[PDB]
Design a binder for this molecule. Structure first.
Ligand SMILES: Cn1nc(C(N)=O)c2ccccc21
Ligand SMILES: Cn1nc(C(N)=O)c2ccccc21
Lengths: 348, 348, 348, 348, 348
C-alpha cells in the first residue's frame, strides 16, 4: 500500500524509505513537500527534478543507501535503468535514470527485470542483493557489480571509490571496489583495459601517490626535473599559465588543487552532472586570467604521466583516444619539434 | 490509512471519497492532481483554494454529497466549522470552512466535536447523521439541521431549497427543507422570523407566484396598476432606469431577469461568494448605463412588495432593517411627499 | 533547425506548425507562451499538460490537422505512439501519447518507426501519408488507417466519424470513415465485429434514425408500445427514474438528451478523457435525484435495442460482453420472471 | 499612500479603484489575489498578464470605467501609453499598454505627460478629463478624443461604438462617438478618411442596414440578384465555399453569422487580441471543410459592397489598400475575364 | 536566427553565448532551463530575475565576459543601458539594465545606439570594442571606458579593479583600470575628483597599504598612537563598540575584517545589490551586540583617515559630503569639544 503519507512517515522516522507501516500529514506546495510537526510545517523535500514533486520525493526516499557506482561509471557503461533500486544522482539532485523497475508506480516500466520491456535495456544489477547475479544471468542486457568473484565470469576490477549517500569515498568500513560485468545481446563482454578518474574535490584534495605528494610539495621546476618531465608541457597543461587573458592549460585536477592553496578562483560548472571529463568556465581571482571552456579531468598524476609519455610527439596535432572510466576519452595532442605544446581532453 | 493515492482511487472509482480501499498512481504538478489512465495523465482536480493542492483535493473528495444548507445560510448563522463533513463552497470552488473535525489530518482541529477546541466554535450538526442531534445538545456553540422534530427543541423552518453537489434546488426525490436550531454559549437561541432569498439565476429565472408571472409578462405600467404599486418607485427600484450614465435602481433579481430577456448586460461579480445580498458592477449593453456597486437581492416579488408596503413613507431617509436568510439586511429608504424615491440594500 | 521561436512564428503566421522559416520573440511565464504584438504580450498557448510548457507548445503546434480517429478508438486498439505526427487529445488538452517519433527532440524516442525502440510499441500509421502503409507492413506492432483498399490486407470498416481539430464529425468535404488494420507481434490481427458509439453531445444532440426521432418526439409509453419494448426496462435504463434519492438507470446518451430538453442537470465528468463508456456524477436539478457513478454510452438507439433484444432473460444476473469501438464492453444484465430489471455498462 | 491593501479595499467596497481610504487583509498566492470574508479567502483577481500579480491587480483596479476607444483603434493610431488612466484590454485580460503615466509606482515612467520621457511616445489624451486637451496641444506625440469641438483643431469623426468595461456598444445613456485628433513630432496630423469595423459577435450578430437584413433573410441567389452582385464572387468571399477540404472565402463576419444559424463551426482565435482584421483557424462542423488562416473582417455589408464595386476588375491579381479603423488594410483582389474570383484581407 | 535551443547549444558547448550555430533539446519548468544529456535533464539556468525565464537565460548567456566596471560605478555615473552587450549584475543574479541594444529581441529597444530611442539614455560604451569610441562621439548621452588615451579627451582614471564574470579583481593578465569619459546632452563632462571603494570581501580581506597592514597587525591603542588618531573616534567608528546592546560604529570594512579574524558575526544584506555604501543588519556572535542598519563602506584606511582629518570638528552635528565612486556620499559627523564622537555614511 504505497502512499505519499507512508513515504513521508518513512522519511520522518527512518531517514529514508524503509518499508515501515505508518502515515504522517503532508502538504505539497509548488515543488516542496512538508509534514506537520506539532502544528507547524517542516520541509521534507524540495524537488529539483523535472518529475512531479510527489514522484521525485518517492524516488529520493527510495534511493540506494549502500555504496553504489558513481553515475559517470554507470553512464559510461550504458546503464539505462536499475533493478529494484533508485541510483540517486546527487550532482543533479535527481534520479540517475528516467524509469524504474519495482520501485514506484508512477515511474515503473516493470516490477521485475525479467519482463520483456527490460530485455533491450542495459539493466544495472547488484550482486550484493539476493538473486541479482541470477537475474543478470537471465538478462539480455545488463551491468553487474559484485564484491567478490563470480564462478565462470572473468571480472573487470572497477574503481577503488564508490558513492555512499552522495559522498564519494574509498571504503574502509564498507566495500566500495566492485567487480564489473556487462552483457550485450545475451553475450558477456570483455570490458576494456581502463584508467579511472579519482573523483577528488578541489577543497579537500588528497594525494594518492609519492608523485602526487611531490607535485603538491615541490616547486614546478624541481618536480619537472625529479620526474624527467622536460618537454612534456606540464608548465602549461598541469600547472597552468595565468600570464595572458586566456588561462592556459590547467586540465588536471591536481594542478587546480595546487593553485587553490595559494590563490582562489571561480569554477563555473555550466553543465552540472557527473562526468569523466568536466568543463568549467574558470576565472582566476589573483590574475584575471580566464577560460570559457576549461576541460578538467581528475587522473592520478602517475596515470596522466604514463598516458602523455606513451604518445608519439612527431605530428603538429592529433586525437589521442584513452579508455577512462570504461569510456573512450579523446584528447587533443599538439606538438612542435618533438616536444608537447598542449594535451587536453578534446572539446567536441 | 488515509492517503493521497487512496483519495484518488475513491475519486476515480466512486466519483468522490467513499471509504473504499485501494490506490491509483498520482502526480501533482503545480496545483493540479493527475492520475495515469492508458499511459497518459488525466486531470482529477485543479486547486482553486488557498490550501495546499493535496489537502484541497482531499477536502473536495470528502465533500458532503447530500442536500446541504446554502453557504449564505451557514454564514448568516455564524457557522465556523462542520462536524465530520466538508461543506464545499461551489461559488468559491473551496471548502466553506477553514478547518475540519474528523475529516483530514492536515485541516483537523479535532476528531470529534466534543473536544474542548470546538466549544467556542459554532459547529454545524446534521440530524440526518446518527448521534449529531446529541452532539448539538452537548455542544456549547452550534447550528443543527433536521428533517423533523427534535423533542423539546423549538424549530425554525428553513428555506425550501438546499444545495446538492452545487445545484441549488427544491427537492422532490430528496428533502431540502430543514428545521434549523442554534446554540450560543450553551444556550439554545431563538432564531428570528425571516424572509428567504430564492437563489435563482438570471439566465434560467423562473417565476414562483402569479405576481412574478405578471411582472415578467405584463408591461411596467399595467403591472404597477394591477398590483396598486403607484408611488412605490418600482419603475426605479425593480424595473431599473437606463436613461442616465449611472444605472438607476435595479436591485431585485426578477427585474434584472426581465431586462435580460430583451437586452443583455454584464454583471461583474467582484466579490465572488454566496451571500444574501450580492454586489455587481453592472454595464447595460443596449444603453451604456452602468453602476459600480449595484446591490441585488433575489426575493420573491410578493415578499419585496410586502416589505416596501409595510414601511412608513413620511421621512426623507432612513435605515429599514429586514431579516432575510436569518441575517439583518439594512435597506436605505428614501421618500418625498409620502412616496418612495428609492429603496435599496444599503451598501456598507 | 527546430526552435521555440520558429514554432511560435509558425503558430502566429500559419495557425499551426507548417515547416515555415522564421522567428518571433517569445516569452515563457509559468505555463503560458506569449509573443510581442504592438509592444504587448499576446498569449499563444496555455499548457494544461504534464510536459514542460515549451515542449507541450511544440507538440500542440505540430498536431495533426487532418481528420483523425477519435482518441477512444486509438486507445481501444492499444495505440501507444504515432508515426511522425501528434494526435492531440482535445478532451484532455494534451498529446494523446506520451512519446513521439520524428516530431520533437524532447519527446522523440526515434526519428523513424523502423527503429528497434518502436518494434514493441503499437505505432499508429496513416495511409494518407506516403510510405506509411509500407511502414505498417514492416512494423512488428501497429494500427493503420486508410481511405481505401490495401492489397491483400483484410479491412475493418471504422466509424463514420473522425476528429478534425477537436470537432467530431462525419465528413462531407473530407473523408472521415477509415479502414482499420492492426498488427500484434508481427502478425496482422483480425479486428472484431463491432458497434460504434455515436460521439454526440448532450446540448446539440441529433437523432440519426426514425427510432431516435420517435424516442425524442413520442411519450415514454407510446414509444415503448410502438417499438414492442415492454419488459425491456427502458423506463429505468433509457428514460431514467428520478423518483428516489438515487437516480435509476439513465445509461444511454439519447435518454439524457430527452431529459435535458425538459429539465437541466449537472454531469460531473470526474475522469475527463475520451472513452467508449463515460462515468458521470449526475445531479438532476428538478428532483434532486442523483448518482455518484452513472455510466453513460452513446449508442444509436437501434443498436442498443438490438443488443438488449438479443439477450437471454432467464437468469437473475450475468455479464453481457458487447464489442463497441473495437473494445469488449461488459454490461450487467439483471432479470426477473423473464423480463429485464436493469442493463448497464458494468462499473469496474 | 498607495498600497495593495488600499487597492483591495477599493475593489471590495467600490467595485474598482475609487481613491477611497481604507485597507482589507490580502493574501497573494501564485497569480491570484484573495481577501478574507467571514474567515475564508475570496478571490478578487487572477493575473492573466505578464506583469507581477500585485502590479496587474492595481492596473486592473485603476482601469478606465468610462466608454473608451476599442484597443484596435488605439493600436491603429499608434498609441503607446495613456495619460493618467489605464485602458484595460478585455480581449487579452491585460493593460493595453506596457507603461503608465501617473497611475502605479511600478509601471509609471512619469507622473505627468509633460515629462520629457513622454515626448517621443504617442500619449492617449481624453478631452473628457480637465486639462487633457491642453496637454495634447503641448505633447510632441499624442492621440486625443473629445465629445465636441476643439477650437482650431480639425476633427476626425470616430466609430459610433466604444468599449465600456469590456462591452462594445453604441451609447444611448453615454456618448461613445468621439472626435479623434493625432499629433506626430509636434505637428497635428490629418487623419485619413476611413471605414470602421462594426465590432459585432458571431453569436449575437445584429444587422445594421436593410442590405444586412436581406443577406440574413434571403437565399444566396436572390440576395445576389436583388443587389446586382453577379460577377463579384460573393458566393465564395461572403457566403463561403464548404465543398472542398479547404474552406473557400468566408472573410466577412456577416457570412459567418449566417452560416452559424444553420451549422456551427469552430473558430480558433490563435492570436487573441483586438484587431481590425482577425485570423481564425476555422473548422466547419457540418462538412469538415477547414482553413488554417481565415482572415475575417466585420464591415457593414454596404461598406464591403461599396469597396468591392469600386475596384478595377481587369488584372489577374493586385493589392487593394482600404483605410479601415484609420489603418491601411491590404486586400488581395483576384480577377478573371472582368469578374472577381476572390477578394480577401491579405495574409502578411 | 536567434533561438532558445541555439542559446542553450552555445551555453552547453561554449560556456556562454558565442554566436555558434547549433541546437540542443531544452525543457523549461517554472523558472529553470534544462537540457537533455543522454536521456536525463540537466539544469542550465535558474531564473532569479523578474524577466521571463527564457529571456533572462538569453541575457545571462549573452553577458559580458571581459572585465567590466562594477555595477555600483555604472549606476553612480547614471548608466541606463549598454551598447551591444549585457552587464550582468552578479550581486542581484540579474541584468544590470532593464533594456538592451542589439542583444535580445525581447529586451531590445534598438539594434544600434545611434537610434533616436537611445539619444536621451546614458549609453555605456566600451572602447575595447571596435567603433564604440566613435559611437560615444556621436552619442548625446553616454559613458565611455577605454584602456588607453583618447585623442582630444581628458580622462578620469577609474578604479584599479573591475568585475570579471562576477569576480572583482585588480587585473594582472588583463587590464581592469579604465579611463572614464561621460557626455550629458552632447557635452563632454569634467568628471569630479573622487575616492574609490576597494570592493573587498570580509572573508578574504587583503590590506593595500602599510597603514592597512598596521591596522590588522597592531592592537587598537598602538595603531591609534602610531598614526596620531587620538580624538578621531576610531575606537567607535572603525574598531567597533561591542559593549552595549546596540553595536557602536563599525562602518569601515577593514574594521569588520579585523573583528572577523577573532569573532564571527552575521551580516544581513537586506537590500542585496552593488552599492558604494552597503547597509547590514549586524549581530555580533561573541557579545550579542547588534545594529539594524549598520552602514559599511570599503575605503582604503588612508583615504578614510584623509577624509576624517580634513573635517572641521567644531559643530555638534553636520552633513559631510564626499565624492566616492563618482557619487556624492553624505556622512554624518558628530563632534564634542573639538573631538569626533562618530562619523558614518548617512542613513537617509
Ligand atoms: C558463466 N556465466 N555466469 C553468469 C552469471 N553469474 O550471471 C552468466 C551470465 C550469462 C552468460 C554466462 C554466465
Ligand atoms: C574630442 N572628442 N573626442 C571624442 C570621442 N573620441 O568620442 C568626442 C566626443 C564628443 C565631443 C568631443 C569629442
Amino acid at each position: 500500500a504505497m502512499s505519499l503519507e507512508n513515504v513521508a512517515f518513512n522519511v520522518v522516522n527512518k531517514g529514508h524509505f524503509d518499508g515501515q507501516q505508518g502515515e504522517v500529514p503532508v502538504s505539497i506546495i509548488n515543488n516542496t513537500v512538508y509534514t506537520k510537526v506539532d502544528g507547524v510545517d517542516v520541509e521534507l523535500f524540495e524537488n529539483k527534478t523535472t518529475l512531479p514533486v510527489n514522484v521525485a520525493f518517492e524516488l529520493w526516499a527510495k534511493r540506494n543507501i549502500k555504496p553504489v557506482p558513481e553515475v559517470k561509471i554507470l553512464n559510461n557503461l550504458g546503464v539505462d535503468i536499475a533493478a529494484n533500486t533508485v541510483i540517486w544522482d546527487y550532482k543533479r539532485d535527481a534520479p540517475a535514470h528516467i524509469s524504474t523497475i519495482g520501485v514506484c508506480s508512477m515511474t515503473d516500466i516493470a516490477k521485475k527485470p525479467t519482463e520483456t520491456i527490460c530485455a533491450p535495456l542495459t539493466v544495472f544489477f547488484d550482486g550484493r542483493v539476493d538473486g541479482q547475479v541470477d537475474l543478470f544471468r537471465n538478462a539480455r542486457n545488463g551491468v553487474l557489480i559484485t564484491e567478490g568473484s563470480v564462478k565462470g565470469l572473468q571480472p573487470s576490477v572497477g574503481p577503488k571509490q564508490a558513492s555512499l549517500n552522495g559522498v564519494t569515498l574509498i571504503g574502509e568500513a564498507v566495500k566500495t571496489q566492485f567487480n564489473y560485468y556487462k552483457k550485450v545481446d545475451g553475450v558477456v563482454q570483455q570490458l576494456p583495459e581502463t584508467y579511472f578518474t579519482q573523483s577528488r574535490n578541489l577543497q579537500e584534495f588528497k594525494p594518492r601517490s609519492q608523485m602526487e605528494i611531490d607535485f603538491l610539495e615541490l616547486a614546478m621546476d624541481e618536480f619537472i626535473e625529479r620526474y624527467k618531465l622536460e618537454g612534456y608541457a606540464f608548465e602549461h597543461i598541469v600547472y597552468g599559465d595565468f600570464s595572458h587573458s586566456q588561462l592556459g592549460g590547467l586540465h588536471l585536477l591536481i594542478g587546480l588543487a595546487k593553485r587553490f592553496k595559494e590563490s582562489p578562483f571561480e569554477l563555473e560548472d555550466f553543465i552540472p552532472m557527473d562526468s569523466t571529463v568536466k568543463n568549467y568556465f574558470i576565472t582566476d581571482a589573483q590574475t584575471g586570467s580566464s577560460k570559457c571552456v576549461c576541460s578538467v579531468i581528475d587522473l592520478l598524476l602517475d596515470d596522466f604521466v604514463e598516458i602523455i609519455k606513451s604518445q608519439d610527439l612527431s605530428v603538429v596535432s592529433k586525437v589521442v583516444k584513452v579508455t577512462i572510466d570504461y569510456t573512450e576519452i579523446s584528447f587533443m595532442l599538439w606538438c612542435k619539434d618533438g616536444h608537447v605544446e598542449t594535451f587536453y581532453p578534446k572539446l567536441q
